[PDB]
Ligand code: HEM
Ligand code: HEM
Ligand SMILES: CNCc1cccc(-c2cc(C)cc(N)n2)c1
Ligand SMILES: CNCc1cccc(-c2cc(C)cc(N)n2)c1
Ligand SMILES: C[C@H](O)[C@H](O)[C@H]1CNc2nc(N)[nH]c(=O)c2N1
């Protein structure tokens with residue numbers, strides 16, 4: 001009941017007991033392993049105080065006042081407000097703790113060494129899609145910090161009944177538009193073409209280029225969402241050059257500095273925050289491997305390998321592999337020559353192993369998803385390839401949620 | 411109870427019901443996922459007929475004579491021999507079926523599209539370490555076929571009591587020697603230095619170079635094993651050159667053509683074959699990524715990147731990534747210019763997706779381990795990165811077993 005994870009590059013072993021505190025199910029049974037399925041699958045007051053009890057107990061058991069009366073009066077206070085209103089509200093300190101631990105428990109995140117250094121923006125007083133748009137601009141500006149990126153989350157009012165829900169309809173706050181062409185093909189980002197249509201549907205005026213920043217579709221208190229365009233001076237973008245190849249400029253590629261996921265749900269003490277955009281900084285491979293070279297994304301390996309003049313008749317020339325390394329040299333180089341925060345997959349996996357140690361020491365475990373932790377290129381020349389990870393679901397936590405245009409009573 | 415796996419590069423879905431036939435446990439519980447732990451953990455007659463029953467039932471239910479009397483008389487025959495001798499013996503046809511399906515059920519193997527085209531060598535009449543050495547040479551020679559590699563397995567007598575056990579002590583039939591140096595460092599293959607010591611211990615006369623083929627340590631009928639050196643004319647080796655870089659020859663690297671794992675256990679109908687060397691042909695990355703660039707293996711990225719004159723001050727130059735692609739271009743090129751069978755990680759992952767279709771159609775499922783199927787470089791520019799796989803344990807099956815120098819009553 002006190003399981004062991006081994007590292008095979010180092011022969012180092014650690015003991016996981018943190019998984020005893022786990023609660024939610026994983027998809028795996030004693031006779032089936034779902035570790036590579038992407039997404040496996042009102043809340044009453046009878047269930048809401050147990051979750052409120054569990055959260056608050058570890059929150060006072062973090063500030064070395066577990067079991068005190070300051071704890072007990074807080075437990076009694078939440079208990080009775082869960083009688084009165086049936087729901088409850090978190091303290092400022094309980095929200096900052098809960099948010100930082102949702103990140104800390106996010107087993108699919110390799111950059112979690114930074115989990116404590118997070119800036120929480122309490123937007124629970126927000127009421128309008130314009131108020132949402134204000135909070136979100138202030139997040140963008142702060143989290144960007146002139147390229148010296150800082151991580152942050154903005155927490156909008158929690159779900160109450162179920163109809164009245166704050167939702168950022170964008171998947172990330174900043175993404176490039178996606179238009180399918182009359183000739184069947186696709187301009188911009190193909191992942192967003194469904195979204196982009198809903199944007200033009202709500203009256204967006206598309207510039208119809210490659211790297212068009214989408215507007216925000218912000219839904220406030222269950223209301224029909226409204227389009228707002230982040231001021232372009234707030235959207236920091238990096239033009240992508242290669243430090244050897246001058247033809248690389250003519251590829252005319254760029255990316256935005258700020259990775260800010262907006263479509264997930266923040267669970268704290270049984271409360272559900274449907275709108276909780278959180279931002280850090282990019283690991284190089286997300287842009288240079290996935291965004292740029294996924295077949296159903298920008299799919300640029302074709303053209304990069306051309307300009308390198310590569311043996312493209314043969315699958316086995318590793319022409320694909322060769323153009324993939326140059327592209328991530330170009331992402332990295334470009335972001336750093338502009339002083340915009342980016343981390344390479346070597347230094348990020350190293351930090352994660354480093355983070356993983358401290359978690360097994362001063363916490364007794366680190367939930368971790370190998371399928372997601374291993375970078376999508378050069379897997380085994382990074383140290384996380386050789387690290388056995390235990391995946392389990394701790395709380396507070398970030399969760400996926402449905403897209404709102406497929407659930408909203410419109 | 412009829413689960414679904416999605417592919418996200420193609421939006422294609424398949425339905426797994428084959429997992430209903432699963433039997434063994436995985437390490438994962440409803441609340442913990444062990445998908446990245448490498449190895450999670452006499453047989454009586456009360457348990458041995460159920461396993462014999464299950465096997466034979468699907469074996470006649472493969473040749474469209476399920477439930478017939480030819481089946482029933484075979485079930486009665488095994489039943490009564492399990493009374494008489496308590497164990498039993500497989501027909502030739504039952505051994506070839508059982509062996510091909512152990513391969514077919516091997517969820518960690520990406521080359522399983524070939525599972526049916528397997529050559530079974532019945533060495534169950536073998537009695538001596540010299541007889542083992544003969545069968546194994548005939549396997550090497552056949553499976554190699556002048557470089558036109560053919561896949562094969564040699565099945566030595568099954569475990570009976572437990573003391574009398576046929577074991578190939580080598581991990582693979584052909585591996586390079588491993589000597590640690592007086593200066594702390596290591597020559598050859600560091601993975602084998604423990605083995606190499608046991609070989610010199612049993613009186614091996616080490617040439618003490620880099621690429622020294624080890625001898626065979628073959629244990630027959632539980633006896634203390636004996637050293638035999640495969641005739642070098644039978645060991646086909648590929649010198650590694652690059653199709654651009656002439657300095658690559660001076661690296662003086664080579665590899666052997668035949669991947670032949672010798673240390674696993676073949677379970678068929680509850681019978682355990684402790685010696686069952688099986689061989690195919692290499693996927694390029696095993697040599698060019700793992701063998702050559704694992705830190706605890708040949709660790710050549712250092713020197714390759716030197717000769718390329720690479721920015722090696724910075725982790726973020728992807729100098730490691732860059733020398734890794736050239737090395738697998740050199741493995742591939744060298745093996746094919748010599749007409750020795752090798753497959754590149756692109757064409758092998760494609761075939762596996764291709765194999766995966768047919769399994770879900772004419773069988774209803776394909777046990778598959780994503781952690782192992784995804785090649786250890788360029789993961790997401792191959793199609794298996796985007797394929798959800800269900801891992802589960804079907805039988806017949808290949809299993810790991812202890813090393814014999816850590817279990818043998820010597
Ligand atoms: C310090 C900078 C950060 C880095 C370098 C980083 C790194 C990464 C990477 C590479 C991924 C994989 C994304 C993908 O493959 O689609 C990821 C996912 C994730 N990150 Fe982190 N991240 C950072 C900050 C944050 C913050 C600030 C939060 C939350 C407050 C967070 C929570 C998550 C979660 C929940 C996921 C998984 C979401 C999903 O399953 O799609 N990360 N991160
Ligand atoms: C057709 C040529 C074959 C190819 C291209 C191939 C490919 C591979 C690869 C790349 C691996 C991963 C090895 C590692 O990472 O250490 C593997 C493992 C494995 N292969 Fe296949 N293989 C072939 C033939 C065979 C045969 C003939 C058998 C059995 C009769 C087999 C059964 C297995 C098993 C059981 C494993 C996993 C063993 C372990 O967990 O260490 N394969 N294969
Ligand atoms: C399924 N995609 C989720 C997703 C998509 C895109 C980016 C991220 C991300 C988020 C943060 C905070 C940091 C980072 N380096 N990347 C996450
Ligand atoms: C834990 N290592 C197992 C291992 C190590 C080395 C090679 C293989 C292998 C075996 C076969 C038959 C084909 C292939 N392409 N590779 C398997
Ligand atoms: C810790 C981790 O499970 C370990 O590195 C695994 C990961 N996947 C692998 N995949 C293959 N094909 N071969 C391996 O040796 C490994 N090693």
Ligand SMILES: C[C@H](O)[C@H](O)[C@H]1CNc2nc(N)[nH]c(=O)c2N1
Nearest residue numbers: 036037038371372795796797798
């Ligand atoms: C099918 C498979 O689970 C899917 O491709 C996963 C694999 N691992 C991943 N890992 C990361 N970091 N991001 C991803 O989108 C994925 N996709």
Ligand SMILES: [Zn+2]
Nearest residue numbers: 033438443444
């Ligand atoms: Zn699992």
